[PDB]
Symmetry: none
Subunit: 76 residues, 4 copies
């Protein structure tokens, strides 16, 4: 697997939780598949930017906040 990919996924999971969402609800909100999301969170998926963008919409988080977070997460 990839280092970045795991932290993207970790971040996605982090934010979903800090907000109190279920996967079911992140899937609904972003108009994507729930198993799709589960896959990403166990990090069994290699998103495209577009997909990442949809997940950010679903999380209701701007690109900037996401990347600010991803950076922080990246530095152990």
């Amino acid at each position: 697997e990839s280092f970045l990919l795991s932290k993207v996924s970790f971040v996605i999971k982090k934010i979903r939780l800090e907000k109190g969402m279920t996967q079911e609800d992140l899937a609904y909100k972003s108009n994507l598949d729930r198993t799709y999301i589960s896959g990403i969170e166990r990090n069994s998926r290699n998103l495209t930017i577009k997909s990442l963008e949809l997940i950010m919409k679903g999380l209701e988080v701007s690109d900037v906040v996401f990347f600010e977070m991803l950076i922080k997460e990246i530095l152990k």
Copy 2:
């Protein structure tokens, strides 16, 4: 098309020129086709995080540094 993509697209080119690289050099070190590097910069193609990671390694730049410039380009007017 996509907001984030053209930003990612823009930043890949910006860095590449800042480092005096050519598409040929880049696609070189990213072990992607020079067609793909062109494709990305040209028509903001929808790359995968893994591919983006390869390009970062190609640009001889870190995850962090890239995303910090990404944030800057998004914030601009």
Copy 3:
């Protein structure tokens, strides 16, 4: 345009495919531009004996056997 040129350009391609090479290998091995190899085959282009020699070295072929295949191509109907 020129009789001999399209014969030369035909034979460069023939050999290139016979040896299972691609254009951009040959462009490397011949120590000439990517687009020049294309341009020679694609249209014809008016190359120099020195450049022709480089290509022959690149096709991994001798002056002699090149010209022998050149003669054969000229002689065709």
Copy 4:
């Protein structure tokens, strides 16, 4: 300089002589410059196929006969 380019030039000179032609006449017959011809024969020019072709027409020699000769000259 180049081996091939030398043998080419030598051949051009050879054929010119076996036909009893002067350079002046070889240049008239192919409409090129006499100093141009001179230059090739003293191996100071790297001609293009197009030019080579004009010289063959000026020598009144077919492409095939030229290369047949060029091959033989190439083999010592």
